[PDB]
Design a protein around this nucleic acid. Sequence first.
RNA 1: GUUAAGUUAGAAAGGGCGCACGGUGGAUGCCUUGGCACUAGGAGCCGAAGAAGGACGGGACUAACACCGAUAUGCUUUGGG
Length: 59
Amino acid sequence: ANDIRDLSTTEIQDQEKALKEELFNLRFQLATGQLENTARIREVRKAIARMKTIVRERE
RNA sequence: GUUAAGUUAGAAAGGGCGCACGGUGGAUGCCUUGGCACUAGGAGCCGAAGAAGGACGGGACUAACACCGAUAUGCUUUGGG
Ligand SMILES: [Mg+2]
Ligand SMILES: [Mg+2]
Ligand SMILES: [Mg+2]
Ligand SMILES: [Mg+2]
Ligand SMILES: [Mg+2]
Ligand SMILES: [Mg+2]
Ligand SMILES: [Mg+2]
Ligand SMILES: [Mg+2]
Ligand SMILES: [Mg+2]
Ligand SMILES: [Mg+2]
Ligand SMILES: [Mg+2]
Ligand SMILES: [Mg+2]
């Protein structure tokens, strides 16, 4: 969280895009029946949410 | 022994009264999670910066309640523990 604030508000959105891709792939695997650990969904969702929070509060 | 005349018992297809043992049913007793009437203090409005009240959604599994809103069973920060 504090290490997120060290990024230059442009790599932040690259991180957001990468996380969104990972979340979509996780849901694809869960639907197909090939996801081993399901606790990753919450982690990725919360990571995206806090990226968005930090970007918004920087205005 | 037979005959005649006479007298009196017993019986239950079923039923009645008493008792014993069960079933059904939910009274009664005990209990309280919810109510009723007040007292002292606070507060007596919300909305175009979109209200009151809702619909649909968000969980690994999700029919309902509660919580939340595509940042959705939650995000940042300051304190407590
Ligand atoms: Mg008799
Ligand atoms: Mg007979
Ligand atoms: Mg008989
Ligand atoms: Mg009888
Ligand atoms: Mg009788
Ligand atoms: Mg009787
Ligand atoms: Mg009797
Ligand atoms: Mg009974
Ligand atoms: Mg009764
Ligand atoms: Mg009162
Ligand atoms: Mg179900
Ligand atoms: Mg949004």
